[model samples]
Target: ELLKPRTLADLIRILHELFAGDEVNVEEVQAVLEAYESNPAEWALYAKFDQYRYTRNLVDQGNGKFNLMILCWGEGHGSSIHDHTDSHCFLKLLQGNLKETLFDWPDKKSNEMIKKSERTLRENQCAYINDSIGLHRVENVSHTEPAVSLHLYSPPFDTCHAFDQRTGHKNKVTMTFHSKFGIRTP
Candidate 1:
């Protein structure tokens, strides 16, 4: 029942097999998430300062072809507004609370009609996102404690344009690829 991805390569191998031929879909990601629900202890759920943040995979880069990642979050922390340039995404909450918000680029630093997206993943809850409407942001709503979740990107997300919430400026960050055993891969 525990799909313990022993290494980043192992997890990416699973995703490669799962999303073969066709584009990655919600149902398939859900099936994979079931494994996480069945086995939460298998993941590296850690804490960042007062926030809970963890990254499972950092290599998912394949010339706009292959990229994926599993991100975990603690309470009150949020991600910047951004989208995968050429990939789809999926997120499933294994434990705690997560609130995601979707914003559309209105003109500059202004986002119009900022609306909340998806239900808070209490336990074993999931959400899916694709390239079509993939631009969104997520945050932990709890004042105390933290939330944990998983993210999958295909081909794996290596570098992505990140937008600042306050200034609306964009920046890029290269990923530090690592294998599952917490070893940096060459």
Candidate 2:
């Protein structure tokens, strides 16, 4: 087990160090994420709510290297099947339950994606993806309670391609933000 960082800054520092090398060690990153989940003190920074659309709230926008954000999912909220646009992404399920589905394009000439697998995650579970196999979607599994997750992305991106699972059509779009810090914003 790993120890949680004292603050969000400490967590960012740990991640920075881990990603600084030419090759990133996935296990180490997950270890740090597990540590962060274990400490209640570290969870105090994020906001929560009972009603609203799914939200992507920016936490600590790491110095152009990566980004830290909390995804708040209201009832029936989820994400589209998409790729992270060459960035390394990490996710930690923080509250409630989330159903994650992954997809893959079997043929280079075909845009159709085949369903790879589906899994449900509870608090403290972590997932990682890179450009190699980043096609996936996440949804809140609760009908009443809201769900929240922590996401870390390396070399932050402004836009990415969202894929249509059934039709295999992909379109580039900018990411939407629900809030920054503790304040509500566009």
Candidate 3:
């Protein structure tokens, strides 16, 4: 199960094979992610941090079958609570540490939200989630250092809903990349 990829190219190669069509083999994708021992240096080109919010940089678009992104988290940066729509999201920490807090999906009729659980992810750790797993907000847990996480979204998406922490109301959001394919947005 451990593909033991030594480089980003290697990871892409295997992923393309697994996701050759519209449907994805979930177990295979997770195994590939869990097996990878991240080489931060290999991802240096696409890892760019931001002062306002965690940056999302697209590494491989995967022809829309899936996509790979390096999410750079600067000190004190965090994401708004959000849902992945209906896609499968795989996350692997490339550097530093991150804390992901989960909340139950919102009931359209109710405005109240409640926290389900929270956990910390250290470097080289991989986690998997989908709509069924619920909503989450990822934050850089350290104030002194930056964090980088590699994310793979199957059946790629462009927009999702961000939930208001207090009211649980949903705000439609469009996902944007800080950079694409190692090049800064032009």
Candidate 4:
């Protein structure tokens, strides 16, 4: 009852308070992510599914300090290996299992990436990543079942880079949301 957030609005309220000041502690935010329980009843309305790619739904913009979103992944949908552009990104497995593959920052000239680590996040598990930690690719990995994940990006970034595994090619990708405030985008 003390720190539990019962709804999306409730969670965002807490986050706003935590990020109210200039300095925000990483562990404190992690603690909230670890404790947060994803209730479909509260957020499912915003989980708009997309067949072409995972759906990114904005739950709150967090007043320019941070942003929170729900990413709905279709079966076997995988995001391209990408960086956060220096934002502190925190994620939690909201509904299903996901695989996170981390790699060392791509070579400055060649764009080759070195595999750093890989791990699976089960429902309710939390993970954090930043540009300093390296780039990552996230996949639902279930051939038939879909997955949903919650994300918090501080000082929300509008663009980032995606890397190609085979060709070592890197491209700038712009971020967009499928929905905002539980409303679908036009």
Candidate 5:
């Protein structure tokens, strides 16, 4: 028997309820992600990938405390080594191939990062990270096929730090979006 698909409204409602609590942990984030998997088609409209760049399009930013986004990765596109600041982040791979590399800061004052580990996240897989976890970089593993993932952030990140591995330089970056609520830039 096939399951009845959940809608985006249902997702918003559930997530609001989940975050209403005093704490939002990895397990809670994982549960909401499981619901997203059951109705992946609901987010199909916001899943467009750019050939030139990876796109982070907003899905929803609730009460300024929670943020949801759909990230599209063109072939071999990925993020620089970055920190999430105080916000907690969770990523769920919805389609295609992904490789995530986690890093550790050997010294607090410098941009020097130590390679922690790397892992592949295939379709339907999820991962979580936070400020206490150090830094990470994510990339599309495919040479041709594009990838898409859903990301959730609590107390939504406005600014964060990025590191340059080659130069040992770190800089703060303000977050911006290519689109919001399915409306893309021209």
Candidate 6:
């Protein structure tokens, strides 16, 4: 039901009501997991992503209500430096190793990769992302196998900007265009 929000306006409404001005909390995450466990069909929607053959669990839900997705990144595949436009998110690593890199861009030295965090999840590891402290990205980082993750956002992430630290470039793009699924040219 991720696409349930349909429009960016509807998506933003949910995010503001549910996730605005809140820190990622364990209790909120647990509620999402419970919803996943209770409704297998809903979770199945995410399982449909490529490489997620193992089955999908709900993971987390950002206040933006309609911004949820299932993502599978194979070995050597990961996300670039990007941030959602006024959104908060929750993520759960369903399988394999995922290297998370968090960054901070302050004044003159804008767009710098500050700190990098790494972790691996097999079944039930998760984390949250709100507007504050939400600037980060994840990658498979595994040289041997693929990694699967579930992400939920509040206010559906339609527009986002990505940055390349090495070359110091920025690009505005659609979140859908970045993924392999449902990414088609008009």
TM-score of each: 0.67, 0.85, 0.94, 0.94, 0.88, 0.62
The Cα error of candidate 3 at residue 55, in Å, is: 0.6
Which residue window of length 10 is worst by lDDT in model 4?
A: 1-10
Tell me the TM-score of model 5: 0.88
The candidate, 1 or 5, that scores higher on TM-score is 5
Q: Give the least accurate 10-residue stretch of model 5, judged by summed lDDT.
A: 1-10
Off by over 4 Å in 5: 1-5, 38-40, 106-112
Model 2 lDDT, residue 140, Cα: 88
lDDT by residue for model 2 (50-129), tens: 35567788887766677888888887888888889888899988788899898884354545678889999889888888
lDDT of 4 by residue, 1-186 (tens): 238776667878888989988877888888888788878888887789998899999988889999889999999998999999889999998899999999877665675567788999999988999998888999998998899999999978989999988655789999999999889899
lDDT of 3 by residue, 76-139 (tens): 8999899997999999998999999999988776577899999999888888889998999899
Candidate 1 residue-wise lDDT at 87? 67
Distance from true location, Cα of 26 in model 1, Å: 4.1
Worst 10 residues of 6 by lDDT: 177-186
Tens-place lDDT per residue, model 6, 42-81, is: 3343444444322223333443354555676766777777
Backbone clashes counted, model 5: 0
Clashes of 6: 6
- The per-prediction CA RMSD against the true structure, in angstroms, equals 5.1, 2.8, 1.4, 1.7, 3.2, 7.9
**By the TM-score metric, which is better: model 1 or model 2?**
2
Model 3 weakest lDDT span, ten residues long: 1-10
Q: What local distance difference test score does each model get? A: 0.58, 0.78, 0.88, 0.88, 0.81, 0.54
